[PDB]
Amino acid sequence: LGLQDFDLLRVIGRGSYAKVLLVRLKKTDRIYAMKVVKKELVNDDEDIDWVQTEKHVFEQASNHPFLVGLHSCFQTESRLFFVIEYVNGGDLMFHMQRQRKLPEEHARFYSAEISLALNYLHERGIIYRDLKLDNVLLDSEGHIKLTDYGMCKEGLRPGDTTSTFCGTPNYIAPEILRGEDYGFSVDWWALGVLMFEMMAGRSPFDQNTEDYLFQVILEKQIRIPRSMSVKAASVLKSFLNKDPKERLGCLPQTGFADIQGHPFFRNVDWDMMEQKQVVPPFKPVQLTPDDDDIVRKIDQSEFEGFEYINPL
Ligand SMILES: CN(C)CCCn1cc(C2=C(c3c[nH]c4ccccc34)C(=O)NC2=O)c2ccccc21
Numbered sequence: 341l342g343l344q345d346f347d348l349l350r351v352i353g354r355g356s357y358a359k360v361l362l363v364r365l366k367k368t369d370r371i372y373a374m375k376v377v378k379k380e381l382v383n384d385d386e387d388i389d390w391v392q393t394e395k396h397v398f399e400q401a402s403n404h405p406f407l408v409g410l411h412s413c414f415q416t417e418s419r420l421f422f423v424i425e426y427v428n429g430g431d432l433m434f435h436m437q438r439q440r441k442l443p444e445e446h447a448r449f450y451s452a453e454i455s456l457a458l459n460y461l462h463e464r465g466i467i468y469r470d471l472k473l474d475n476v477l478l479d480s481e482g483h484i485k486l487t488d489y490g491m492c493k494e495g496l497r498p499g500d501t502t503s504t505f506c507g508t509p510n511y512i513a514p515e516i517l518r519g520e521d522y523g524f525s526v527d528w529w530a531l532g533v534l535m536f537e538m539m540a541g542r543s544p545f546d547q548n549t550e551d552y553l554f555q556v557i558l559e560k561q562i563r564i565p566r567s568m569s570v571k572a573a574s575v576l577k578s579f580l581n582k583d584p585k586e587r588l589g590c591l592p593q594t595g596f597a598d599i600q601g602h603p604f605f606r607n608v609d610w611d612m613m614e615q616k617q618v619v620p621p622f623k624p625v626q627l628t629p630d631d632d633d634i635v636r637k638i639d640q641s642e643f644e645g646f647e648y649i650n651p652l
Pocket residue numbers: 352353354360372373375408424425426427428431433474475477487488489
């Protein structure tokens with residue numbers, strides 16, 4: 341493909357690294373949100389991996405219901421693009437700000453779909469690592485969908501463990517702070533948080549930000565609402581166990597079964613929801629010319645094979 345066959349209908353998201361356009365393929369007339377990264381921003385061997393990994397993941401979320409698909413990938417002298425599956429329900433971040441706290445039930449429905457999403461990921465040797473309220477977008481009529489893959493960890497057999505200190509601070513797992521090696525566990529800690537945020541409307545931790553924050557996370561015994569349910573709390577406790585091992589879903593060869601097993605997920609029929617057979621508790625421009633001054637200075641070499649159209 342190429343910019344040609346597209347109708348750059350709008351800009352829906354502006355970043356330093358990327359711009360997310362709301363484009364439409366003329367041929368199919370269908371819509372996809374395309375991700376635009378200035379090539380001039382991904383220089384050096386440690387940035388092609390940031391891309392190839394986003395690519396390697398996007399080459400997988402296509403197979404899962406709560407994970408954003410990838411239509412195709414093309415470049416230009418000045419940049420790189422991602423024709424991605426499109427979503428329009430918004431990010432729970434917004435939905436939250438417009439409602440404060442969530443009924444334990446609703447909250448449950450979401451946390452479930454995400455685990456399923458996280459589970460598929462893990463099973464495929466992937467560590468999302470960038471889970472946060474504004475990353476979980478809403479399906480046209482409800483179902484969630486994990487987004488952003490610029491912090492995931494590639495191929496990895498269970499038992500393995502990486503150690504890149506990263507992720508959005510408010511959700512960074514305690515073992516990450518301890519600089520100890522880690523795995524799928526950090527993804528459940530994040531979920532634990534995402535869940536606290538939904539039901540409590542608040543965050544579970546609270547000199548200087550990071551400085552201070554990181555200490556809260558590592559010593560501050562989390563305060564659960566005295567309005568909250570027994571089951572509700574329990575899960576939160578389980579997921580926010582500062583011990584990767586003693587943590588829900590973190591137990592090896594049982595993790596997901598554990599999760600599903602937990603009382604908080606008592607009447608939940610996974611195989612049913614995994615198929616979206618459960619009802620959601622809530623139904624929802626030309627680019628700048630190339631600057632030869634810059635472009636002329638690009639390697640273009642470290643840009644082979646970027647192109648790729650999803651056959652499915
Ligand atoms: C706080 N926000 C809105 C963060 C945007 C998170 N995000 C959404 C998306 C996606 C979509 C968006 C759907 N609405 C958007 C508004 C602004 C930016 C992106 C989107 C979409 O339809 N499909 C997506 O994968 C995305 C893609 C790559 C990296 C990050 C992405």
